[PDB]
Design a protein around this ligand. Structure first.
Ligand SMILES: [Cu+]
Length: 161
């Protein structure tokens, strides 16, 4: 299946693995803090989806932001960024090699794009992964989903699992 072991650094400075995410339903979003529109929109969608899922099903789903820009996105940078969207949003970062291993595992494309206004941007896969409480992949959610189609979907999966 899509995913596998990782050793990353959480927004609090603690070193984590896939085992630190176990025990709760999880949604993983790969992004970068310097993203102008895509990532802020997707996370806003995710944060509002987290709350709607809870209201409708009673299930606490943990949103997870994984950085595809480790050169700029430090622990302090990721921490400050994640706190803006939802109080329950975990931020994961690491070494460019650590990030390479986890993106590979999740089949995520990421490539630095030179920019004049930004120093550069990271071109990447606009993806969400609904992992279960035993960290096994359940469903994928693309850019085309709205808060309602994400909520409805996640809620449908949880009940059938
Ligand atoms: Cu982005």
């Amino acid at each position: 299946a899509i995913g596998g072991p990782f050793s990353l650094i959480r927004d609090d400075g603690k070193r984590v693995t896939e085992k630190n995410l176990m025990g709760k339903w999880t949604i993983l979003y790969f992004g970068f803090t310097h993203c102008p529109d895509i990532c802020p929109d997707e996370l806003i969608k995710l944060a509002a989806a987290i709350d709607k899922i809870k209201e409708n099903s009673g299930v606490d789903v943990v949103p997870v932001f994984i950085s595809v820009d480790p050169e700029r996105d430090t622990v302090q940078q990721v921490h400050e960024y994640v706190k803006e969207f939802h109080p329950k949003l975990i931020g994961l970062t690491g070494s460019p090699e650590e990030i390479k291993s986890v993106a590979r595992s999740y089949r995520v494309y990421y490539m630095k794009t030179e920019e004049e206004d930004s120093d550069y941007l990271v071109d990447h896969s606009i993806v969400m992964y609904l992992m279960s409480p035993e960290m096994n992949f359940v469903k994928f959610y693309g850019k085309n989903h709205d808060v309602d189609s994400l909520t409805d979907g996640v809620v449908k999966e949880i009940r059938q699992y």
